[PDB]
């Protein structure tokens, strides 16, 4: 029912002309069909402080693999490594 994934790298663009970007990589999702079809889904990832963050997938970037994501609420102090989930 639930799903998981693994973060790749979060770009915190200093300036402001494209906003900050975030790359995610769900376990398998080895099908542009499924990946592309998953575009629009909500990523509900857990995290300490009971701070449950929930962003949204924008576009796919890897065809049958990872996808692009963005977070306006940002993540906690250094959180590059926590598994993502679609709860």
Which CATH number do you get for residue 67? 2.40.10.190
Structure-solving method: NMR
* Cβ pair 62, 50 in contact under 8 A: no
Angle ∠(60,85,24) on CA atoms, nearest 5: 35
42/51 Cα distance (integer angstroms)? 16
72/87 Cα distance (integer angstroms)? 19
Contacting residues for 67 by C-beta, under 8 A, at least 6 apart: 24, 26, 29, 35, 38, 39, 57, 59, 60, 61
71/45 Cα distance (integer angstroms)? 11
Q: Residue 28's domain spans which residues?
A: 1-87
Among all chains, which residue has been given the structure tokens 């592309």? 36
E strand or H helix that includes residue 33: helix 32-38
**Count: domains in the chain:** 1
* Cβ pair 29, 43 in contact under 8 A: no
Structure letter (DSSP) for residue 82: P
Q: Say if strands 4-11 and 42-45 run parallel, antiparallel, or are unpaired.
A: unpaired
- In this structure, the chain runs to a length of 87
């Amino acid at each position: 029912m639930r799903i998981k994934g693994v973060v790749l790298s979060y770009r915190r663009s200093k300036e402001n002309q494209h906003n900050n970007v975030m790359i995610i990589k769900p376990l398998d999702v080895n099908s542009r069909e499924e990946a592309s079809k998953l575009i629009g889904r909500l990523v509900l990832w857990k995290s300490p402080s009971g701070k449950i963050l929930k962003g949204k997938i924008v576009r796919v970037h890897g065809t049958k693999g990872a996808v692009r994501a963005r977070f306006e609420k940002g993540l906690p102090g250094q959180a590059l490594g926590d598994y993502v989930e679609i709860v």
